Design a protein around this ligand. Structure first.
Ligand code: Y65
Ligand code: Y65
Lengths: 86, 87, 87, 86
């Protein structure tokens, strides 16, 4: 059972992680890289320019089996019950 | 326009851009992105997610660096009353 | 009561307890804590914060473990429409 | 300039940390331990019991010089521009 620092390194290397203390079961978080995509309308082209850079982010597979954008809570940050998920 | 977050949230859900006077970075705004469903790209993805992936709606921020971050309001964001709609 | 977060937020600011049907833990609720000002406890604290410390209002969660966590809504919390006032 | 994992260890040891990439200047975050306090009214005594345990948390000294409860953003989590603050 790892602290968040080790779970973070795991995330950045492409692994999945979860916490034993989470109330929902079978969930995991994972890293998604950033990228660039093309502005497709002049309305979007005006707001964001011709091509748009987006930052990397983290995602969570929820108990509903859909994907949420995810930010650890302070309890998640401070916990030492993280595990890498196969 | 000095809106509270409830009114900024209604604006977000209606597809408008919002920002706060009290943010330290300037020229930023947040906006809503709908959820959806994409087919799994690789067999390694299929082994974890199945054939399809449903993703929830989320919020995005156009940052001072003019790139796009995923965004969740801070507590100070949530409690503030200096929100405005951005054109 | 199937409130959106704007209505749950109004309730929080009025001093009520709120929770979500869609939370995984049960029997939890969030509530508002006002800001304030406390004198600095030690000289080491005074060297960093001065004589007084002003702290902002914040939100708290009574967890399944029945202890109190500081709390910030998730994006799913913010976008949900299954909020209720708790007695 | 550290990643968040090292900034987290610093926090847990009682140090102050900040990020070079923060828009506001002169800010820092720090760790606050948990504790117990007594329920003072029967209204509170009924809701939370006779004595209340509260978890540790993180705080931020903001540009307004007041203290906010603080959760790192995903950009904070993923950044590698953390520094310990004297
Ligand atoms: N549908 C969804 N969309 C977006 N994110 C979702 C999600 N479902 C789960 N997550 C995220 O996955 C992690 C653990 O999931 P889980 O513990 O099952 O969450 P829950 O029971 O529904 O929490 C009820 C309230 O307490 C917050 N919270 C603060 N720390 C915790 C962990 C643990 N309980 C503890 O106390 O240490 C919870 C939480 O955000 C919510 O407002 C956590 O990052 C959580 O945000
Ligand atoms: N009064 C206050 N109450 C409570 N927490 C406060 C606070 N003031 C600052 N903080 C916290 O201190 C950290 C850095 O402070 P700062 O960067 O100056 O925040 P800002 O410019 O006002 O952000 C405008 C929007 O973008 C979010 N955001 C996401 N990552 C970042 C960092 C950096 N910009 C990046 O993009 O990597 C910002 C941010 O939450 C807000 O919704 C950050 O954890 C932030 O939440």
């Amino acid at each position: 059972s790892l602290n968040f620092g080790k779970a973070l390194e795991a995330l950045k290397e492409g692994k999945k992680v979860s916490r034993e203390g989470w109330n929902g079961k079978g969930m995991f978080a994972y890293y998604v890289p950033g990228g660039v995509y093309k502005s497709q309308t002049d309305v979007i082209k005006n707001t964001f320019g011709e091509e748009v850079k987006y930052r990397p982010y983290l995602a969570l597979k929820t108990v509903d089996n859909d994907i949420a954008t995810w930010t650890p809570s302070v309890s998640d940050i401070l916990a030492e019950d993280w595990n890498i998920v196969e």
